[PDB]
Design a protein around this nucleic acid. Sequence first.
DNA 1: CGGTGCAACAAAT
DNA 2: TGATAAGCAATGCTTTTTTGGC
DNA 3: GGCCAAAAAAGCATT
DNA 4: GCTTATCAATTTGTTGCACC
Lengths: 96, 93
Amino acid sequence: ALTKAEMSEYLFDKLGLSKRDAKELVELFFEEIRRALENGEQVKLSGFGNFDLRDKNQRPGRNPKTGEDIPITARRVVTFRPGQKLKSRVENASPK
Amino acid sequence: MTKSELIERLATQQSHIPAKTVEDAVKEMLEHMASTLAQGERIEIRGFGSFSLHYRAPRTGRNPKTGDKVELEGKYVPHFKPGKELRDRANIY
DNA sequence: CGGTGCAACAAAT
DNA sequence: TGATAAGCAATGCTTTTTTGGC
DNA sequence: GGCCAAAAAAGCATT
DNA sequence: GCTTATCAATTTGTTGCACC
């Protein structure tokens, strides 16, 4: 799996960024996306996809193990809608 | 917030890095993420989320506009699962 | 550079 | 598991965003 | 940095 | 219109990555 470390090293090799600035930049990148979503804002990354917020109202649930009918509290969740460019790129891929 | 707006925000915060490098860095990270998925490998960033590929069986679909049948092949589609920190921080309720 | 502890993970249930 | 919510097959037209030069 | 027009990508219809 | 995803609780095993 791709990790931050791997992403950092890649910026180092490809752009010559210092292993320190590279590491900080990767982290700031994900944090900035969380901040926007945290502030109720949509995040649209052209060529990749969109991180959208959806508000859900409580609905019927239960314990998968026991079966005790427990409700699913209402909540605001983050979703990702991959764009067409990215979808085309991975359609014929295969789990490595 | 769009990709350019994100780059603008990062640039301001990373004053020690030339705006240009930040922009090149963001474009590079996104390609590294897309490329990883195209290679059929997952992405797992603790506290943000993980991206994986979901399989879609072949099926007889339709051109929703005309109603004509279309034969679709099996395929894989990206899928994102938000992480704990992100779920919490995002959930206003 | 590399070693370690562990909340965040995945998957079963 | 099971009630409920979300996403999508084709594709032409519109709108937004990016790109690259000044 | 902005301004511009052309291209790329997304958005819409409905998806 | 039909298909896929959301989610509930707990246990068990894996890993990103902060820290040393």
